[PDB]
Amino acid sequence: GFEGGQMPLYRRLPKFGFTSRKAAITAEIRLSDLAKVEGGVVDLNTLKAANIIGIQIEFAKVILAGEVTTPVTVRGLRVTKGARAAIEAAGGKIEE
Amino acid sequence: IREKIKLVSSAGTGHFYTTTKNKRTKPEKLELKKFDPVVRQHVIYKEAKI
Amino acid sequence: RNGRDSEAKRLGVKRFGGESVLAGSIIVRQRGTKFHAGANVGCGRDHTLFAKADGKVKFEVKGPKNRKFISIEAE
RNA sequence: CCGCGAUGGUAGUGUGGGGUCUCCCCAUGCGAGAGUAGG
RNA sequence: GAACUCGCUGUGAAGAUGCAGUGUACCCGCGGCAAGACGGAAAGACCCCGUGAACCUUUACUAUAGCUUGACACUGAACAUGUUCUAACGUUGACCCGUAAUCCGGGUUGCGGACAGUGUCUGGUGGGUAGUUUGACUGGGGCGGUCUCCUCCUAAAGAGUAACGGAGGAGCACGAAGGUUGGCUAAUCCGGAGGUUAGUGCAAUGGCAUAAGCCAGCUUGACUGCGAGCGUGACGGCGCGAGCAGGUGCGAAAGCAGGUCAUAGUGAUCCGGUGGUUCUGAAUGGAAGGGCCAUCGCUCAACGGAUAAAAGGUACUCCGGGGAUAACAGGCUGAUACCGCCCAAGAGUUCAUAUCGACGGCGGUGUUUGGCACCUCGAUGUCGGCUCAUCACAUCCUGGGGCUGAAGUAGGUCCCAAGGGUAUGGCUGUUCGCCAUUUAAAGUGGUACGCGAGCUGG
RNA sequence: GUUUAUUAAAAACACAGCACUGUGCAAACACGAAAGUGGACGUAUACGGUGUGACGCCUGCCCGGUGCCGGAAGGUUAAUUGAUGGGGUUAGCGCAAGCGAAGCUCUUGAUCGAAGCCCCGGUAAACGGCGGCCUAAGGUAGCGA
RNA sequence: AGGACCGAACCGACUAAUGUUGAAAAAUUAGCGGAUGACUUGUGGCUGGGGGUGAAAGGCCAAUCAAACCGGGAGAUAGCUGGUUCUCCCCGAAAGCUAUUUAGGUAGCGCCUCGUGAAUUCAUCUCCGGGGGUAGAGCACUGUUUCGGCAAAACCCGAUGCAAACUGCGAAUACCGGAGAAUGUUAUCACGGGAGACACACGGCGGGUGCUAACGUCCGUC
RNA sequence: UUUUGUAUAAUGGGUCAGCGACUUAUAUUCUGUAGCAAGGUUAACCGAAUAGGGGAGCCGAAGGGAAACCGAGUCUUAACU
RNA sequence: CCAUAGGUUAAUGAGGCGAACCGGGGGAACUGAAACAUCUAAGUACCCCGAGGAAAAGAAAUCAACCGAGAUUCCCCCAG
Numbered sequence A: 001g002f003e004g005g006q007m008p009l010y011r012r013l014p015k016f017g018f019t020s021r022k023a024a025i026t027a028e029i030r031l032s033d034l035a036k037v038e039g040g041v042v043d044l045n046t047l048k049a050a051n052i053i054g055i056q057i058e059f060a061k062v063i064l065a066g067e068v069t070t071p072v073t074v075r076g077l078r079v080t081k082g083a084r085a086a087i088e089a090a091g092g093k094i095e096e
Numbered sequence B: 001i002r003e004k005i006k007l008v009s010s011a012g013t014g015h016f017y018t019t020t021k022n023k024r025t026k027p028e029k030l031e032l033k034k035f036d037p038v039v040r041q042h043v044i045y046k047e048a049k050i
Numbered sequence C: 001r002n003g004r005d006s007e008a009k010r011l012g013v014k015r016f017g018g019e020s021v022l023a024g025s026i027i028v029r030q031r032g033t034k035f036h037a038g039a040n041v042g043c044g045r046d047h048t049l050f051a052k053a054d055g056k057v058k059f060e061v062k063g064p065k066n067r068k069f070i071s072i073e074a075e
Numbered sequence D: 001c002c003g004c005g006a007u008g009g010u011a012g013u014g015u016g017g018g019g020u021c022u023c024c025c026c027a028u029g030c031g032a033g034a035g036u037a038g039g
Numbered sequence E: 001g002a003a004c005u006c007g008c009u010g011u012g013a014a015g016a017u018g019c020a021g022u023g024u025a026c027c028c029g030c031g032g033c034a035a036g037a038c039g040g041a042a043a044g045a046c047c048c049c050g051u052g053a054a055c056c057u058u059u060a061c062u063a064u065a066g067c068u069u070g071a072c073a074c075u076g077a078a079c080a081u082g083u084u085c086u087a088a089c090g091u092u093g094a095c096c097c098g099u100a101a102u103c104c105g106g107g108u109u110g111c112g113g114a115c116a117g118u119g120u121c122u123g124g125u126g127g128g129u130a131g132u133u134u135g136a137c138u139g140g141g142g143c144g145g146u147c148u149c150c151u152c153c154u155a156a157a158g159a160g161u162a163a164c165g166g167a168g169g170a171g172c173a174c175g176a177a178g179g180u181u182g183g184c185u186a187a188u189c190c191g192g193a194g195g196u197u198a199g200u201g202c203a204a205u206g207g208c209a210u211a212a213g214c215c216a217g218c219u220u221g222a223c224u225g226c227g228a229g230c231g232u233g234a235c236g237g238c239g240c241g242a243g244c245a246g247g248u249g250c251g252a253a254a255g256c257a258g259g260u261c262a263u264a265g266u267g268a269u270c271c272g273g274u275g276g277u278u279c280u281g282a283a284u285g286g287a288a289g290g291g292c293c294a295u296c297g298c299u300c301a302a303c304g305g306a307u308a309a310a311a312g313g314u315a316c317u318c319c320g321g322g323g324a325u326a327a328c329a330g331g332c333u334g335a336u337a338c339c340g341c342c343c344a345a346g347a348g349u350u351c352a353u354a355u356c357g358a359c360g361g362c363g364g365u366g367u368u369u370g371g372c373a374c375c376u377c378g379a380u381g382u383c384g385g386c387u388c389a390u391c392a393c394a395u396c397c398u399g400g401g402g403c404u405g406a407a408g409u410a411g412g413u414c415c416c417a418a419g420g421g422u423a424u425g426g427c428u429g430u431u432c433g434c435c436a437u438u439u440a441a442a443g444u445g446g447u448a449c450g451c452g453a454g455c456u457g458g
Numbered sequence F: 001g002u003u004u005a006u007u008a009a010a011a012a013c014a015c016a017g018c019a020c021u022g023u024g025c026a027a028a029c030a031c032g033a034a035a036g037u038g039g040a041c042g043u044a045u046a047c048g049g050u051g052u053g054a055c056g057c058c059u060g061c062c063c064g065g066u067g068c069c070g071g072a073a074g075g076u077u078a079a080u081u082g083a084u085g086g087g088g089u090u091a092g093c094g095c096a097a098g099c100g101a102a103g104c105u106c107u108u109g110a111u112c113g114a115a116g117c118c119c120c121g122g123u124a125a126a127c128g129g130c131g132g133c134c135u136a137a138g139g140u141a142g143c144g145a
Numbered sequence G: 001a002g003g004a005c006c007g008a009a010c011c012g013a014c015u016a017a018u019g020u021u022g023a024a025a026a027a028u029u030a031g032c033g034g035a036u037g038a039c040u041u042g043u044g045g046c047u048g049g050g051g052g053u054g055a056a057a058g059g060c061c062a063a064u065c066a067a068a069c070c071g072g073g074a075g076a077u078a079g080c081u082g083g084u085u086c087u088c089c090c091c092g093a094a095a096g097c098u099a100u101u102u103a104g105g106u107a108g109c110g111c112c113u114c115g116u117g118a119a120u121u122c123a124u125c126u127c128c129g130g131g132g133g134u135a136g137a138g139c140a141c142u143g144u145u146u147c148g149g150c151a152a153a154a155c156c157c158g159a160u161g162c163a164a165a166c167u168g169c170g171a172a173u174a175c176c177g178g179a180g181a182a183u184g185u186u187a188u189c190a191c192g193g194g195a196g197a198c199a200c201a202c203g204g205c206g207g208g209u210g211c212u213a214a215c216g217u218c219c220g221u222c
Numbered sequence H: 001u002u003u004u005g006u007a008u009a010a011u012g013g014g015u016c017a018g019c020g021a022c023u024u025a026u027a028u029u030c031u032g033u034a035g036c037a038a039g040g041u042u043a044a045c046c047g048a049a050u051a052g053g054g055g056a057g058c059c060g061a062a063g064g065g066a067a068a069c070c071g072a073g074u075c076u077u078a079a080c081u
Numbered sequence I: 001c002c003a004u005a006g007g008u009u010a011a012u013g014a015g016g017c018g019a020a021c022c023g024g025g026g027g028a029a030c031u032g033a034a035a036c037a038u039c040u041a042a043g044u045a046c047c048c049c050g051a052g053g054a055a056a057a058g059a060a061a062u063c064a065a066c067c068g069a070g071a072u073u074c075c076c077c078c079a080g
Ligand SMILES: CCC[C@@H]1C[C@@H](C(=O)N[C@@H]([C@H]2O[C@H](SC)[C@H](O)[C@@H](O)[C@H]2O)[C@@H](C)O)N(C)C1
Pocket: E327, E328, E379, E380, E381, E382
């Protein structure tokens, strides 16, 4: 980063933002992960057991990424509008 | 010699503009109708300290 | 007592006669109206002439004063 | 639309070459301004 | 480094045994001399450079021992809002014992006494001591000047373009000097002429009558969110911009308005302040703190801003480097200097030219003062003298000659001529110079201002 | 007399003499985190520090600056103390908005407060200074290329 | 009597010569100063490194002193100097700009190389569309200049020149864009891996500076 | 060797022999190559085991936003042509 | 005055050395920051005391997050 003594780029530009502690304990689940759990119920604990998310994850969101081709119950996870449609189209259900 | 001032919204939004003034020549308070983006209306703004 | 000068301002013609330009394109940077804005050409606050339409740059000498105008001939 | 102007010569000059090289000349290309006839 | 290791004149990283041309020269010792091998010796000590060192200085900066201030502690008792008291504490007073002891301890006693003194905290003082800072550019360095921004010229008719090049400006102003609609047109000279020769809030340039110049009325578009596209920058950035949404002013409306004729009027980031906020909130609810939006604090002017905070000395010096850069000498140059010539104002009784040559002109030398920084900083010893020289000729003497305002004697001036010759002393480090006294004369220059591996060392 | 052992022997250092100044003895002062020790088994005719440098004739004016000494009214001022105000939290009160005791807590900083400094004097054998209207005062005696 | 006098021993070290790869890392020779004193000398002791000691020279403290010596931190750091070892093949710079307590350092960009991707992408010429304010010229303007005329010597007029910061004119070239052919190993642009370089020199042309001095200096361009 | 430029009178080397200077560890990125592939790979450790076990982790398959959060979108803005 | 200090004798133990590791008492600077003072180097080098075959640490006034874990030590992750 030394530029010969000119105020370097990483000092002439301002700092911004803060780091969220909540982001570190939030994960995203792909539709392709929903079949990888044991027993057709997707919640934090079954996702942890399947090694899909880390053990310290407290919150998770299912997103429209990959495909779901089986009926799955999703319990206690947030689901995107697109993921909800994909899960319900595969005969699944979503429980808050 | 021109001093910086706030023009503060009369709509009570806390929105302000900033400008300069020569207080020696013009000691009276500057008052202008200006757009307040909080209420999204032209309202009276009145001079205050920076 | 000398030894001073200012930075050169890169004035002058940016798009010459017959050049195809997009709307917004600067045609000339200048001090005052050395050139004037013709058809489909705007004049900025620093006397910059810029295209208000897509087309070809055209220089022309018109008026009683015989002034250099810049227009855009729309494509 | 926006109240001058040939022809010829001269000045300058791109490229190549030369001299006695502060400045010129030759080959070739471009060729004013001013002025003149005239309009 | 290797050598089969001559002179000269040139050339050449610019002073050649080694290159060119040319001259000279059989092979090899010995004694001698030191002109050259930019001889040997020592990574120049001078000089500059390095965001090198050391030690020294101080009203440089920051600390700090020491000294000093007060608060609390060890530290107590009677009233005063005064002193007195003894019991803490001190005693480097006396005496006694441990004890064969001018230490130490214990005891007795006197004196002092909550003082003194010490600890923690705290203000002051503090080159006594310590760590450091003390800019860069620069025709060497220093001194002076400069450092950011704007305008013109240099700039070679696109842009850009350097110098310690040539000239000037800025570090603002303005709630109108901004917006819009309507209206108006100057300088200057003598109502007329004239036509911007004025005006522009302030430099200069390019603009401006449709006026951008100027006046009045009504105003706040000196709006908020955005932005096709483009210009200009290594980047950070900076600039121009139709159009879209919201809300506004002026005007009858078309339309115009996101500051000002344009181009200077400026300061990154960090740290923090203020207001706002569907953000965050370390068990949870809050809060603190943080984020986001708006905004504030730099002559940080060495103006891309090393720190919040900094001057000097070194001949007591030291290291790393540089002939990237100065002092000597060489080189290039020849302004200056010196020498020569051209013209002829005139002076010279008369007469420009015997002699002198105003105003001006043209050269030569390398020769003074300089310019440049090419050679040398892993060293090219630098002034003067002494010793020993050698060349040039622009000749001081002696030799030859022309002119003369040359009677003679003796001069003047110019030409030819380099064979030989060309003072000693006083003073001063002197070179030089002045002085004394000589001489036919006491020449002028080049030779690393000849000559310290020859001497001296003023 | 002394000195740069190894380029300087001197006009340098020292010196007797002089002056200023500190120092009352557990002296000042110095070495030492200290105990102690030197000063001194001395005691102001003594001891330390500083400058000057036998002797003779002498040693002028300036206290504005810097230091030192004395002063102590007034201004300013540390730790300390924590008055007052402002905020956070929440028992409650409110239908909600909000309000909000006590406690704890974050902040604010009244009052108290020594020396120093400012201030008022003194002091030149203290550091220093000693004119062309101006200064703190304008260089006396003596001497002088 | 005496820091008295002359002078050996003894203690010193003023001058000169020699010596300077010495006889000697300070001496020898001839002279020189002190020589009862603040003298000199033997033995032993004490003072220790920011410390000692110093009749004070930054002198001396084991041939070492503006901070001893030895060991350690330790391979301090060194934007500086030096040096950097076998072979062949292909390509092939820069000595510039901007910024910098920067100027002989370094960073981004420019220029080199390797890889990947992509357009008739690029170049030359011809033709077409462009803006110029240079060379030259000129004197209306802004200044400067001479002569004549005219006349409040102004102004005005005629005649003559001069200009980097004058322009009522104005090239060649160069540059931007468009079209077309031929030619060229994509010569072009983008992105990515690796750089080096940021002391340039002379010569030609156009110039500033200097004396149209310099193998001078500073730009532009080949 | 250093330089704009050195026969240079700039630097270095008296000669020979021997020694004498881009390494090593860990991280990271790019290229080549090999394996496996929407997956890839395990660390310590266990194991007599270069095996085998061990998937704790790490990288990748989703981004946008300061963040809450939304998510093939998201941020910006009252809202986007 | 009692006493205590003190004195003599006896018994028992200590003392000194040793390469590293270990706990504790003290504790630099060069250097890096392209200068330098905060900061760094580093609680390193070094000095000192003490120990043991190891030492130290150790049986929650510990974490966690409303679910739970269960002394200390060491290794790999978490994570530059
Ligand atoms: C104006 C001066 C110009 C400089 C003089 C010369 C130089 O440095 N000389 C050395 C000499 O010292 C000794 S002579 C005592 C040496 O023997 C001799 O060789 C030589 O190095 C000393 C005098 O400084 N430089 C090259 C240029």
